[PDB]
Amino acid sequence: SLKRALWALCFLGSLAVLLCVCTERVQYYFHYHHVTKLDEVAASQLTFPAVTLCNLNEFRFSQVSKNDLYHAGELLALLNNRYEIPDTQMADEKQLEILQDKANFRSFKPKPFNMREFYDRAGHDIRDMLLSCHFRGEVCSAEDFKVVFTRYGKCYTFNSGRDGRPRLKTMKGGTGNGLEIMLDIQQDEYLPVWGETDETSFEAGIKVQIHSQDEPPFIDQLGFGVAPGFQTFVACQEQRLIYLPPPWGTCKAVTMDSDLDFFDSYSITACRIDCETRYLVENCNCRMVHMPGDAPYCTPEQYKECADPALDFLVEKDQEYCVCEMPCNLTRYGKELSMVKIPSKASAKYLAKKFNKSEQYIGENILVLDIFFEVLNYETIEQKKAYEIAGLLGDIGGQMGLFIGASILTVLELFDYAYEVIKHKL
Amino acid sequence: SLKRALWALCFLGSLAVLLCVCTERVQYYFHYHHVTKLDEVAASQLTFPAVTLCNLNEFRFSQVSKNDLYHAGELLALLNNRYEIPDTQMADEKQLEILQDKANFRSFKPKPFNMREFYDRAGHDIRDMLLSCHFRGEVCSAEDFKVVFTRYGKCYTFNSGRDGRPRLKTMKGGTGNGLEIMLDIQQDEYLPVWGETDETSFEAGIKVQIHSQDEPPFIDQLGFGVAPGFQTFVACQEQRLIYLPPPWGTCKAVTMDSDLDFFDSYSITACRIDCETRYLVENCNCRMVHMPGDAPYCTPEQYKECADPALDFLVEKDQEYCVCEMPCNLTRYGKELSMVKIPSKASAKYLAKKFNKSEQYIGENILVLDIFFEVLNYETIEQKKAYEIAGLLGDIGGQMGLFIGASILTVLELFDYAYEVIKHKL
Amino acid sequence: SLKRALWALCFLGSLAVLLCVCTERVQYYFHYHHVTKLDEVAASQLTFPAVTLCNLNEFRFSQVSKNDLYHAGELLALLNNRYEIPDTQMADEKQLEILQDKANFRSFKPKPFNMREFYDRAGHDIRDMLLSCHFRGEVCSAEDFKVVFTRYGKCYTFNSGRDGRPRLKTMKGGTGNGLEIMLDIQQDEYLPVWGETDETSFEAGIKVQIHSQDEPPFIDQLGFGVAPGFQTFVACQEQRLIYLPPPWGTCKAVTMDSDLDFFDSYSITACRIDCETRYLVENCNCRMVHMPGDAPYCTPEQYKECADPALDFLVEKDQEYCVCEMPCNLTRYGKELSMVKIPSKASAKYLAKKFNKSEQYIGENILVLDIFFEVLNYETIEQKKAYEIAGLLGDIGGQMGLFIGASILTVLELFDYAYEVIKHKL
Ligand SMILES: CC(C)CCC[C@@H](C)[C@H]1CC[C@H]2[C@@H]3CC=C4C[C@@H](OC(=O)CCC(=O)O)CC[C@]4(C)[C@H]3CC[C@]12C
Ligand SMILES: CC(C)CCC[C@@H](C)[C@H]1CC[C@H]2[C@@H]3CC=C4C[C@@H](OC(=O)CCC(=O)O)CC[C@]4(C)[C@H]3CC[C@]12C
Ligand SMILES: CC(C)CCC[C@@H](C)[C@H]1CC[C@H]2[C@@H]3CC=C4C[C@@H](OC(=O)CCC(=O)O)CC[C@]4(C)[C@H]3CC[C@]12C
Ligand SMILES: *[C@@H]1O[C@H](CO)[C@@H](O)[C@H](O)[C@H]1NC(C)=O
Ligand SMILES: *[C@@H]1O[C@H](CO)[C@@H](O)[C@H](O)[C@H]1NC(C)=O
Ligand SMILES: *[C@@H]1O[C@H](CO)[C@@H](O)[C@H](O)[C@H]1NC(C)=O
Ligand SMILES: *[C@@H]1O[C@H](CO)[C@@H](O)[C@H](O)[C@H]1NC(C)=O
Ligand SMILES: *[C@@H]1O[C@H](CO)[C@@H](O)[C@H](O)[C@H]1NC(C)=O
Ligand SMILES: *[C@@H]1O[C@H](CO)[C@@H](O)[C@H](O)[C@H]1NC(C)=O
Ligand code: NA
Numbered sequence A, B, C: 001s002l003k004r005a006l007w008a009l010c011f012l013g014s015l016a017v018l019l020c021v022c023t024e025r026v027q028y029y030f031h032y033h034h035v036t037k038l039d040e041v042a043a044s045q046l047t048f049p050a051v052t053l054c055n056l057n058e059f060r061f062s063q064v065s066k067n068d069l070y071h072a073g074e075l076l077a078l079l080n081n082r083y084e085i086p087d088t089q090m091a092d093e094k095q096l097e098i099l100q101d102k103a104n105f106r107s108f109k110p111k112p113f114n115m116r117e118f119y120d121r122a123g124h125d126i127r128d129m130l131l132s133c134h135f136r137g138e139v140c141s142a143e144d145f146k147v148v149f150t151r152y153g154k155c156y157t158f159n160s161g162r163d164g165r166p167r168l169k170t171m172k173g174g175t176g177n178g179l180e181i182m183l184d185i186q187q188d189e190y191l192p193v194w195g196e197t198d199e200t201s202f203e204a205g206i207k208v209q210i211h212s213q214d215e216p217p218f219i220d221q222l223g224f225g226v227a228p229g230f231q232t233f234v235a236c237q238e239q240r241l242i243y244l245p246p247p248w249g250t251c252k253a254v255t256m257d258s259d260l261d262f263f264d265s266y267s268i269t270a271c272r273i274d275c276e277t278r279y280l281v282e283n284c285n286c287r288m289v290h291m292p293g294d295a296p297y298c299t300p301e302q303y304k305e306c307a308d309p310a311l312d313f314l315v316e317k318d319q320e321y322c323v324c325e326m327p328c329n330l331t332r333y334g335k336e337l338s339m340v341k342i343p344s345k346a347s348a349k350y351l352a353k354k355f356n357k358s359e360q361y362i363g364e365n366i367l368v369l370d371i372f373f374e375v376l377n378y379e380t381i382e383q384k385k386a387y388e389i390a391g392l393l394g395d396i397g398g399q400m401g402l403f404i405g406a407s408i409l410t411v412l413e414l415f416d417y418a419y420e421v422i423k424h425k426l
Helices: A007-021 A095-100 A116-122 A269-283 A300-312 A348-354 A359-365 A389-395 A397-403 A408-424 B007-021 B095-100 B116-122 B269-283 B300-312 B348-354 B359-365 B389-403 B408-424 C007-021 C095-100 C116-122 C269-283 C300-312 C348-354 C359-365 C389-395 C397-403 C408-424
Strands: A034-042 A050-055 A146-150 A153-157 A179-184 A206-211 A224-226 A230-241 A332-336 A339-341 A366-385 B034-042 B050-055 B146-150 B153-157 B179-184 B206-211 B224-226 B230-241 B332-336 B339-341 B366-385 C034-042 C050-055 C146-150 C153-157 C179-184 C206-211 C224-226 C230-241 C332-336 C339-341 C366-385
Touching: A007 A397, A007 C408, A034 B034, A034 C034, A050 A179, A050 A366, A116 A146, A116 A153, A206 A230, A206 A332, A206 A366, A224 C230, A230 B224, A269 A300, A348 A359, A359 A366, A389 A397, A389 B389, A389 C389, A397 B389, A397 C389, A397 C397, A397 C408, A408 B007, A408 B389, B007 B389, B034 C034, B050 B179, B050 B366, B116 B146, B116 B153, B206 B230, B206 B332, B206 B366, B230 C224, B269 B300, B348 B359, B359 B366, B389 C389, B389 C397, B408 C007, B408 C397, C007 C397, C050 C179, C050 C366, C116 C146, C116 C153, C206 C230, C206 C332, C206 C366, C269 C300, C348 C359, C359 C366, C389 C397
Parallel strands: A224 C339, A230 A366, A339 B224, B230 B366, B339 C224, C230 C366
Antiparallel strands: A034 A366, A050 A153, A050 A206, A146 A153, A179 A366, A206 A224, A230 A332, A230 A339, B034 B366, B050 B153, B050 B206, B146 B153, B179 B366, B206 B224, B230 B332, B230 B339, C034 C366, C050 C153, C050 C206, C146 C153, C179 C366, C206 C224, C230 C332, C230 C339
């Protein structure tokens, strides 16, 4: 034909192109794509994070008695299974002799034992480890820190925001407008390490973690180190992420009491302590010292057959047992370390006078932490939906309004034209 | 009805859905959303940044006279308010005696005093602090650095691009294709610190800031530290941000002389020095030593009642006095430190010969900075408008072209159909 | 007129606005814009990277013979061009005397020489440099590392995934769930440095690079340093980038044998070694020791006129000779260093016994690397097309369906209406 032969390709080919192009805007929508948004909103009064710091030594050597070596001798790796110093050939010169009159057990008649009570008196004490800190020039106290427990032993927490005291805030950047702690890691009272184990440690420092205040401390997997004899400027940078709920991303939404069995808030580091507690109470009824709840802590004899082999199974065979993902409102904290050597020539003769110690002791034990904010900004890393439902109806309609010019009314008009087909002319 | 009863829901319900969906594409536009764009454009000849480095000690102790302790004795924290060494019990062994015959003032008849003139001769000198630097193997001079002033005292600047000399460029990554400075922090000439103040400092190092060349140095809030006895590889990474003007984001746009009262360009660190100058000249007519302009610097007696308490008020009560935000064309510089111990066994006997100093002095005072580019890239972090006006008319039209099929012509055709209503049939 | 005079502005002005708005959605498409997508997908079993570590000293001083000083004396900077120790006034006390009876050449009759054979026996040996490493507690061997060659001399590689052994994987974060190497940098056997050159080095440490396993080691431009006497916790963070092919970005797509002349895979660091090989074999037929292929390595006499001046020309005059960009599937590795001082008071008397060395030697030569993953995540930084072709036809049609209401059918209906013009009425 002349008029109708051209429309066999025109109206049908444009319809054939439309079904290819209308699908790739509907197949695109069900991917649930999302793009991000980095911003840098300045502020004037930023809150302070929660520093958590503890020594790299769990137990003070000068504060273990003849009772504690009896029950926990396999735990400290100071005795064998037969209760003896395991052939310490050329160990030391004096530190044998403190154990030579404490590892006797000659008809000892041992007292009852506790495990949390062992951590509290034989850990390092912040009344002696700390010398003088500050906060914007205003002085500290030892009562500003709080005793927390984790795998490294007794650890402390500054600005935790727990048990009544509120949270502290900075109003300036700089270096002297944050913490200036002056610790003393006490290398005289370390555990003697003349033996050898796979878990042995040679170092001597302090593990610090800077986290938000809505999390428990998670020192063993998130903390950095700070060397003695150095002043370390830990600059910070507050980041506020905003994630997306499924099917876009993966985020358990925030609520009042979401998935709380032993805590109140919800966090990633608040969840592996939850899943490593319910597994231990249900397997052999233990509870390690850092786990929350009211279940009784178990003996160090149970520590070799319930602590290590059961918590090996959460990373060996039962990695599908519990799973938990990021909350939708995080707050991270970046860090940019840099070190400056602390005991200068001018200060070697004053610090030796003030704390009554040798100049050799000062260069090997004094450690100045220094935490601040770099500039008073905070970055936001959001996740925004790339293709909403209200934008799908636009681009699916603008193609139909281009190729055939038919609206959603006229397709129903053809559907009522088939009603004119069925009985009016048939 | 049969034909018209169905259109009471068809034409009206699709219009009812349209007003919900056309609003959420107009309410979306007035949020002014924006998404970002990270790119990594390789290059071949990148410019070099502007290193700014100075000691952690403001005044050399062996270069203060009996005049300078008279006027600035409260400033250096070496005298009391009654002009005496404040009970330095067991201070030192020799460093008392330099002050025992300089803190006399027995009918001294004091000369006139200046404050910038005190900084220039009693600060640390780069002719003696610097030993030998390099740039791509080609040797330095002491005349490549420039004297600048900030809160830490006299500080120097490499590759500043000021007073005629052009900017230097790198053509390779590596470690030996940048600065290799060998400083000497001079711990023999530090200030004696047998006293105690809140502002006291024990450390001994060097504060470096790597910034762009369109900014003044802002050492006290943006600089890291470098320890003596270590060689620190400061790797860099050039970033070029592009921000957005309001109402999308917050950015004063770039111009020729934007908001310049004492500078020429515009920057964030070039603005707080501006706002801390206009406040000080209008309150008690002072000018601290690091502030630009022609107003006269004031005496250290005015330093206790105008420098510290007035600049306390900009972070206490008048945080709304001046505000200034990011320019739209920044250039940052990342950094990734790492340290290697400098005085090796092979070099302990050569450096002791060449600079005529003991092996104890070399391990406590020699410091090798090493700044380079890691790879010759630069990242761009742009901010792009998510929903322009030209895309609003598409998605607002494709919905109307879908639900009712009415264009902007036919709504005016109905508006002229009401003209046919008003007088042709009424 | 009354009806037709209004349509001179209505139908024509809306058409006039349409050509401005339809262009800025077609001019927008040909920019090929793209936005990014940061995600954080958690995992459970992440692969381990490939550590590459070597000393900062190329040649052991106690293992160069009287033959090697004859041919390579200009290379090591130990002799002059006239084969003599160049006036070493007050050099040392003993280390002259090893060279005083080795730099004789009194009728030496020199043997034939090789250059790769010189690197293999006079480099540092991992059987003596390494003391004890670990991997998740399970012990190492010296046979887990692999000899590779680069510009720093003989370097080693852990977890390379080459020559049959598979790749190792972690299942936990923490600090003791990665490498814990205990190196010994051997400062007794360093080269004597009483001379002076522009390329001279004072430091003594170890350069480590953490890279993926699809790259050759590129130590001299991508490695950080690790100081002796310190234990450095190198935390990691696996990133998986996805780039875009042109015209959006710049990326040679991944294939089986893309641009491989001496390698198998494709990478950025695998390409500059390619371009620095083809240039050297075609200019003066050399091959430096770190270049792959079968071309013969050339003498150190050729090293002064072919190694340095020809490889100066790739960064001076022929920077357009070869160019190669990022592959579309990278894998980077971030790092966050932190140091803890290693030889504690408890371990000073045990390490002195176990490895039979003085306490002075332990604090100056023992170095504990510690590499782990922080948390078992991996970040994805994708680049997504901002404006596809299927979205162009939507927003270009929704504007035409708004302003004039004309589809692509009716513009062809007017084009056939001109066929009714040409001969039916003319
Ligand atoms: C006769 C011709 C003109 C056919 C034109 C029909 C269109 C109007 C259809 C085809 C594809 C349909 C869409 C296909 C898929 C979806 C996903 C669907 O997703 C949901 O959100 C439902 C599930 C939930 O509520 O989570 C919402 C309706 C929508 C947009 C549909 C709306 C109507 C569309 C655009
Ligand atoms: C009779 C029926 C078919 C109603 C259809 C009317 C539409 C054509 C109207 C409804 C919403 C209007 C929009 C509402 C808001 C804006 C924001 C406005 O924003 C500005 O940029 C103005 C201020 C400035 O210049 O900065 C520009 C016009 C526009 C897109 C309007 C264009 C015309 C729209 C799409
Ligand atoms: C009579 C009136 C209504 C004019 C309306 C015509 C439109 C339907 C035209 C004008 C601009 C044209 C576009 C101009 C440019 C391109 C780029 C072109 O880019 C390619 O991808 C081709 C090359 C390749 O395959 O890589 C694809 C067709 C397209 C979208 C065209 C599709 C049809 C458009 C939208
Ligand atoms: C995240 O949202 C919750 C409630 O939705 C709110 O209480 C909390 O303050 C928010 N946190 C941040 C950092 O925005
Ligand atoms: C200072 O230290 C010495 C040695 O430890 C000790 O004998 C002396 O009592 C100490 N003095 C004070 C005041 O603590
Ligand atoms: C930013 O823009 C100004 C002018 O708009 C220009 O002079 C300057 O070079 C730009 N800087 C960058 C880093 O793009
Ligand atoms: C080297 O130092 C000593 C002690 O400081 C000094 O007496 C001697 O003059 C110095 N020699 C030179 C050449 O500077
Ligand atoms: C990148 O893509 C190639 C093939 O396209 C694939 O073999 C490789 O595993 C991918 N790598 C990553 C990190 O996705
Ligand atoms: C220990 O070192 C000394 C001195 O280097 C050496 O004489 C002795 O033979 C060494 N002993 C062993 C067992 O290696
Ligand atoms: Na659209």
